[PDB]
Amino acid sequence: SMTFGQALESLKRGHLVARKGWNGKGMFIFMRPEDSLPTNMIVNQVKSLPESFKRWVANNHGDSETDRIKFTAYLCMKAADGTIVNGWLASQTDMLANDWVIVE
Amino acid sequence: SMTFGQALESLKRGHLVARKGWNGKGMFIFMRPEDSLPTNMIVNQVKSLPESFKRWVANNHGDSETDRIKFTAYLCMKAADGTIVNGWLASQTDMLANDWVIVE
Amino acid sequence: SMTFGQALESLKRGHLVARKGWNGKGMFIFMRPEDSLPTNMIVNQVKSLPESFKRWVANNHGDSETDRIKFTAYLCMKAADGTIVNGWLASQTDMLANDWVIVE
Amino acid sequence: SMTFGQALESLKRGHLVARKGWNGKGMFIFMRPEDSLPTNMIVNQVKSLPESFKRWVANNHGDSETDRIKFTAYLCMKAADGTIVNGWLASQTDMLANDWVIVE
Ligand SMILES: Nc1nc2c(ncn2[C@@H]2O[C@@H]3COP(=O)(O)O[C@H]4[C@@H](O)[C@H](n5cnc6c(=O)[nH]c(N)nc65)O[C@@H]4COP(=O)(O)O[C@H]3[C@H]2O)c(=O)[nH]1
Ligand SMILES: Nc1nc2c(ncn2[C@@H]2O[C@@H]3COP(=O)(O)O[C@H]4[C@@H](O)[C@H](n5cnc6c(=O)[nH]c(N)nc65)O[C@@H]4COP(=O)(O)O[C@H]3[C@H]2O)c(=O)[nH]1
């Protein structure tokens, strides 16, 4: 069994982790990596951003081929139902628990 | 000024919102949309997923051209420093505040 | 059939609320009220604070100044197991869902 | 120069911790301890609970049964403005950062 801090260090190394308290169900959390993207690609290609954000980027960067915007790493959950919940957050219980385990 | 609930309804409609308490700084939050992705593309194309997740998908879906996995909508923050924080979360203060405003 | 924003407005008015899927486990959330306490009370009376915090207050707030410290309102959950989780937080799913209901 | 996991272990041992960038504003987080309270006390004594919750306990827990209710440990923040934010939550950035420090 691990603390949440050990779970986090495992997540940073690319592993899948879970809490025993979740009682299996095929649930686990994982980390999606950071990347820095060109603003022109943000404006002209990226599907998964709302138009208001893309318009803001376009207004402040124009046609720049060199400007970039950093998208941070973040945690996600593969839920029991199979869906990926982007932006998983840790409850007080999760943060203080010592029942974390490695899934992969 | 708006409650967090009004801010959320604005976010669902694609707007950028902020709290006055943040004191400007060009900060705002926004919603990234939901999508359902083919598992073959998850395995063979998606860059922004860790290899452990991609290997799990490959082992359970193989070469399927029809299986899909849903990635939920989520909130993000465009921070003062210009970075996009994926998976923004609301503090108790944020949830209970009535100083939310529309940015765009 | 209530958004999270409407659930929050109901919580601010003292109700117990839940998402429909929680019914089987009987979970709900509620809001604990704000209060402002005098520094002497914090240092010498309040049991539910760690010694380091009481000590910080004593040394960074003379109780000779007449100062009070505000303890903010916050959300809590009555869990399936019957425990009270202080400091409940909303997942992306919870924030964007429209299946909230009033329990009382 | 501490991960969030090491910060959590220090919090569990009663310390006040912060991220380095918080120094200018003097913010820190701390853990409030768990306790178990008898139901009669919850219904008839505890001020810092809403009436609906006290009423729920009274009607879903006879105080004739000898039952106690556990109130979990949780994190809090001493904010820049000096207020105590009950139920502090960790952002993705906070969870993945390695700039945590012990304040006391
Ligand atoms: N709604 C939704 N769609 C998803 C999600 N994950 C993947 N997709 C879809 O899969 C496409 C390819 O993802 P990719 O290979 O990571 O290719 C991505 C990736 O390389 C990069 N990118 C965009 N946003 C981020 C981000 O927040 N973090 C990282 N690390 N890369 C990102 O930009 C490329 C193009 O992005 P898109 O045009 O959006 O193209 C995305 C998008 O249509 C998700 O969680 N939600
Ligand atoms: N560990 C733990 N114990 C709990 C909890 N809820 C109640 N108690 C216990 O019940 C006692 C009485 O609570 P109270 O009548 O609300 O009486 C409280 C309340 O009036 C006030 N107070 C302290 N902290 C807060 C806070 O964060 N918010 C509010 N609104 N009042 C607070 O100070 C009084 C004395 O506090 P204590 O000496 O701590 O005394 C508390 C504490 O021993 C909980 O969630 N966790």
Q: Is there a contact between A36 and A68 (Cβ–Cβ < 8 Å)? A: yes
Using a CB-CB distance cutoff of 8 angstroms, which residues of chain B are in contact with residue A75? 87
Residue showing tokens 């402040």: A60
Q: Is there a contact between C71 and C34 (Cβ–Cβ < 8 Å)? A: yes
C29 and chain B: CB distance < 8 Å anywhere? no
Reduced 3-state DSSP string for chain B = CECHHHHHHHHHCCCCEEEHHHCCCCCEEEEECCEEEEHHHHHHCCCCCCHHHHHHHHHHHCCCCCCEEEECCEEEEECCCCCEEECCCCCHHHHHCCCEEECC
Alpha-carbon Rg of chain A, whole angstroms? 18
Query: Is ligand 1 within 6 A of the CB of residue B47?
Result: yes
Q: Is there a contact between B78 and A55 (Cβ–Cβ < 8 Å)? A: no
Nearest by CB: D95 against A6, A90, A96: A90
Q: Is there a contact between D5 and A8 (Cβ–Cβ < 8 Å)? A: yes
Instruction: Point out which residues pair with B84 in neighbouring strands.
Output: A71, B78
The structural domains of chain A, with segments of one domain joined by +, span 4-102
Ligand 2 pocket by Cβ (under 6 Å): C 33-35, 37, 45-48, 71, 86; D 33-35, 37, 45-48, 71, 86
Q: How far apart are CA C91 and CA C96, in angstroms?
A: 9
Q: Please give the structure tokens belonging to residue B62.
A: 């193989």
Mutate which of C39, C48, C70 for ligand 2 pocket (most atoms within 8 A of beta carbon): C48
Residue (of D85, C32, D86, C94) closest to B5 by Cα position: C94
What distance in angstroms lies between residue C48's CA and the mean position of ligand 2's atoms? 6
Q: Is there a contact between A84 and A26 (Cβ–Cβ < 8 Å)? A: no
B50 and chain D: CB distance < 8 Å anywhere? no
Residue showing tokens 């919102």: B17
Q: Please give the structure tokens belonging to residue A25.
A: 């169900």
Q: How far apart are CA D80 and CA D82, in angstroms?
A: 5
Instruction: Point out which residues pair with A36 in neighbouring strands.
Output: A70
Q: Is there a contact between A65 and A37 (Cβ–Cβ < 8 Å)? A: no
C58 and chain D: CB distance < 8 Å anywhere? no
Q: How far apart are CA D4 and CA A95, in angstroms?
A: 10
- Residue B10 CA, distance from chain mean position: 14
What is the least distance, in Å, from the CA of B99 to any CA of chain D? 17
Q: Is B86 in contact with A78 (Cβ distance < 8 A)?
A: no
Q: How was this structure determined?
A: X-ray
Angle between helices D4-12 and A4-12 (to 10 degrees): 180
What distance in angstroms lies between residue B49's CA and the mean position of ligand 1's atoms? 9
Q: Is there a contact between B73 and C92 (Cβ–Cβ < 8 Å)? A: yes
Helix (H) or strand (E) holding D31: strand D28-32
Number of CB pairs, chain A paired with chain B, less than 8 A apart: 93
β-bridge pairing B74-78 and B68-71: unpaired
Residue showing tokens 């899934």: A103
What is the least distance, in Å, from the CA of A64 to any CA of chain C? 33
β-sheet with B68-71: strand ranges across? A100-102, A17-19, A28-32, A74-78, A84-86, B68-71, B35-38
- Residues in chain C, overall count: 104
Neighbours of D36 (CB within 10 A): 11
Alpha-carbon Rg of chain C, whole angstroms? 18
Q: How far apart are CA D98 and CA D104, in angstroms?
A: 18
